[PDB]
Design a protein around this ligand. Structure first.
Ligand code: NA
Length: 440
């Protein structure tokens, strides 16, 4: 029934998804400014130019967090605000903004869980191959150093990257996220350079820190299950599990890249010397899990790599964009706790998108999202029972926002955002979370 009295309860956002104010106060151009302004890349014609206006309105966001009774806020710092040219001088006005925001959070009793990199690569870097260039790793670590120097007196818990799989594979292989490239080799190169940047940044942060820090990385993980026990389907499940999960988990754990996936990728695989792998494995203080869905895999020998497709299950519920499978959160956590070295663990995202509307009464009756939280929280109790060292949970998202290639059309908030007026209102699932956390 009850979580630890010191458990972290929060909600999560990312800078480009919420801030707006894309040209204000020296901010540079990010890959997502370029990509969202390219016709056809975003489903609904929208951009992050305004989004939730949280650059100006983070006080309102704090108001929501307070009303929900949370004790933490997971948000990202926009590299474009800090180092507008990507490699170059700092923009002190960017640092001061986040300093005030940090102070406002602490004043409110909300612990800042800061993500350094949530996908907003400065475009000048991308002009020099972006994550396809080792140099971008080096300058990422420089950025991480500067931010920690200024804010590490107040912020203890930091994450280097969010969802490197997405940045590499959706940004550089599948083309659906910024910058929009479509080549496997560049995706895999990008994955390496992200991981290297991570590891360089960890070391840089520890040296720059004015106090000891709790440094992590945030990974999306997708528990994968073969649709049958055939050798074809099991192999398909392994390939998909390697493509999403083990590709990142293994090097981080100091186990190198998984050899099965190296063989599979062939000459598309990256150049990975021992020195880089050592740096990638820089010791972490925690690992963040972003959990949404499972993959029930059938072999798909004509599909692109990894040649594994989802077998739909019409007896499971679906949201606006995903299949719901709460058990997968228990499975993936039990696997981390027993099979990998990372500890403690945080759930740094979990949530769902629905076709939310304000009803005649003025509330948002998003029962399926309440049920989603209740079912996943129950699985976290099961994981805790099994000994998994879980220390906190962040709902994705605090508020509806710019959901990447889906635009503002795909609503993940526990709070509803009216994108015309910028008014926010707590959804019924948000009130549920409030009352559940208060009970805890
Ligand atoms: Na549905």
């Amino acid at each position: 029934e009850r979580f630890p009295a010191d458990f972290v309860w929060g909600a999560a956002t990312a800078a480009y998804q919420i801030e707006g104010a894309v040209r204000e106060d020296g901010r540079g151009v990010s890959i997502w400014d370029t990509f969202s302004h390219t016709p056809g890349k975003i489903a609904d014609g929208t951009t992050g130019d305004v989004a939730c206006d949280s650059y100006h309105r983070y006080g309102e966001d704090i108001g929501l967090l307070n009303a929900l009774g949370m004790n933490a806020y997971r948000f990202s710092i926009a590299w474009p605000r800090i180092v507008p040219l990507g490699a170059g001088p700092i923009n002190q006005a960017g640092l001061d903004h986040y300093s005030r925001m940090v102070d406002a959070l602490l004043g409110a009793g909300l612990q800042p869980f800061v993500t350094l990199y949530h996908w907003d690569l400065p475009q000048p870097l991308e002009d020099r191959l972006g994550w396809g260039s080792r140099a971008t790793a080096t300058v990422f670590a420089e950025y991480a150093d500067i931010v920690v120097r200024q804010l590490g007196d107040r912020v203890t818990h930091w994450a280097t990257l969010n969802e490197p799989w997405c940045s590499a594979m959706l940004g550089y292989y599948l083309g659906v996220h910024a910058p929009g490239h479509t080549d496997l080799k560049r995706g895999l190169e990008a994955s390496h350079n992200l991981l290297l940047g991570h590891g360089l940044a960890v070391q840089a942060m520890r040296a720059a820190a004015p106090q000891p820090l709790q440094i992590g990385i945030v990974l999306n993980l997708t528990p994968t299950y073969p649709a049958s026990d055939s050798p074809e389907d099991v192999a398909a499940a392994r390939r998909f599990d390697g493509f999403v999960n083990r590709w990142f988990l293994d090097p981080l754990a100091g186990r190198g890249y998984p050899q099965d996936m190296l063989d599979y990728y062939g000459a598309a695989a990256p150049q990975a010397n021992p020195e880089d792998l050592t740096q990638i494995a820089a010791p972490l203080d925690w690992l963040g899990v972003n959990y949404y869905e499972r993959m029930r895999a059938v072999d798909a020998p004509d599909a692109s790599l990894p040649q594994a497709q989802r077998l739909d299950d019409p007896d499971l519920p679906h949201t606006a964009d995903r299949e719901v499978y709460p058990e997968g959160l228990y499975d993936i956590l039990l696997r981390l706790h027993n099979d990998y070295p990372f500890r403690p663990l945080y759930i740094t995202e979990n949530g769902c998108a629905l076709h939310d509307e304000i009803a005649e009464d003025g509330g948002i009756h998003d029962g399926q999202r309440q049920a989603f939280f209740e079912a996943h929280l129950a699985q976290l109790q099961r994981a805790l029972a099994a000994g998994v060292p879980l220390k906190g949970y962040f709902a994705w998202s605090l508020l509806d926002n710019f959901e990447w290639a889906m635009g503002l059309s795909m609503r993940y908030g526990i709070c509803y955002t009216n994108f015309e007026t910028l008014e926010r209102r707590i959804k019924d699932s948000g009130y549920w979370l409030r009352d559940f956390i208060a009970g805890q």
